[PDB]
């Protein structure tokens, strides 16, 4: 696993394209050019497991912590390479990398029906319960 | 009325967040004012203030899905004695207005399932918990 460089924007864009296609979710135009800009800056990073898996992490400020709040905005391993520990290794490296940023928390948006992903996340120390209540994510696309 | 907070307003914002956390029996971390002063001054974030009775804290972060950022309404609060009079609605409308200046492609809000009044508020104002026929859950690990 490596932190992506700007030179990796093309492979990151390919993997997100494959991800969204697999899940019948639209593929934005211009992914490679945006990833090249995003990777060049310090409020986000991408981890690559060779060319077959990736984690996209954003950082944003919080008044609760000197460091940022981290969000795992995308986690994906190519279908032929799943169930071999790649995703586990990616997530562990997420924690290691955000720790270098003194991140106070990791947050992940997860669809409720994705029970296999939820089992993976809960196995690795993420929780959806806060004081007996589930935490919900509400959005408005603009 | 509602204004974008300046660095000098950090103390007002910290007070409101303290009151917010005190209302819901949540620990109030130290250094709130000093951190809000830095966040307001330097970071990709902003605070909206309704007088000194309410605020919205919004962060902006990168997205490959569009040119602009994805916005997160990380805190929204109206003092108890001033609720149910449209202040919260006014703050949220101004949130949409300000993030539109940043060409934000999406607004996201984390809401506890048991906060039914807050959920009805967000749902009444164009936010949805449903994506592809499924609820969206927020998973965390505190570090
Ligand atoms: C979820 C995912 C990143 C995990 O990576 P991985 O390399 O397959 O995971 P690991 O080998 O380290 O651990 C296996 C766990 O991953 C989960 N998993 C495996 N395949 C999965 C799949 N198609 N979809 C969802 N979860 C899967 C399971 O929980 C599995 O645990 P199990 O042994 O109890 O069945 C990967 O499977 C994937 O990309 N799935 C589809 C996209 C997705 O769900 N991303 C989650 C972001 S919200
Ligand atoms: C949620 C909140 C920001 C809305 O501000 P507001 O000025 O009361 O809202 P408005 O007057 O514009 O609209 C009224 C709606 O606000 C909601 N509301 C009122 N009091 C509320 C309360 N204690 N908690 C949650 N929502 C409340 C209700 O949905 C109400 O609609 P209703 O008349 O059908 O019951 C404010 O009530 C509040 O600070 N609540 C406690 C903190 C909170 O829950 N924040 C939500 C972030 S997840
Ligand atoms: N079912 C798995 C999904 O994983 C990823 O979404 C990741 C997105 O972060 C989550 O979606 C959120 O993030 C994306 C991108 O910002 C927005 O398009 C979307 N409206 C917003 O809800 C999303 N709800 C879960 C996942 N963590 C894939 N991009 C799509 C795939 O369907």
């Amino acid at each position: 696993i490596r932190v992506a460089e700007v030179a990796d924007a093309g492979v990151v864009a390919k993997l997100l394209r494959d991800f969204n296609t697999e899940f019948d979710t639209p593929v934005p135009e211009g992914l490679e050019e945006r990833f090249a800009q995003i990777i060049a800056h310090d409020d986000a990073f991408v981890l690559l497991a060779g060319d077959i898996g990736f984690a996209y992490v954003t950082l944003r400020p919080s008044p609760y912590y000197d460091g940022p709040v981290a969000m795992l905005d995308e986690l994906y391993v190519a279908p032929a390479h799943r169930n071999r520990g790649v995703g586990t290794a990616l997530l562990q490296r997420v924690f290691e990398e955000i720790r270098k940023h003194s991140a106070g928390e990791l947050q992940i948006n997860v669809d409720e029906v994705d029970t296999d992903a939820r089992r993976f996340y809960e196995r690795h120390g993420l929780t959806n319960i806060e004081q007996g209540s589930r935490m919900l994510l509400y959005i408005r696309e603009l």
Side-chain angles (χ1 to χ4, degrees), chain A residues 47-93:
Chain A
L47 298 173
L48 279 161
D51 72 349
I52 49 87
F54 81 104
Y56 171 49
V57 175
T58 56
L59 306 171
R60 71 191 195 273
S62 162
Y64 293 103
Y65 313 125
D66 284 347
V69 173
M71 177 156 297
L72 180 51
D73 275 323
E74 308 284 353
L75 183 66
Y76 167 87
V77 178
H81 300 261
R82 300 177 174 158
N83 284 308
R84 277 160 262 270
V86 184
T88 291
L90 276 169
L91 179 62
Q92 192 45 63
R93 186 61 183 282

Side-chain angles (χ1 to χ4, degrees), chain A residues 10-23:
Chain A
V11 48
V12 184
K14 169 176 176 294
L15 291 174
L16 183 50
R17 173 162 63 244
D18 293 343
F19 191 7
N20 280 7
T21 299
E22 180 183 357
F23 285 81

Side-chain angles (χ1 to χ4, degrees), chain A residues 37-52:
Chain A
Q37 300 291 300
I38 290 167
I39 287 168
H41 291 51
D42 63 313
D43 52 352
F45 64 87
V46 172
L47 298 173
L48 279 161
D51 72 349
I52 49 87

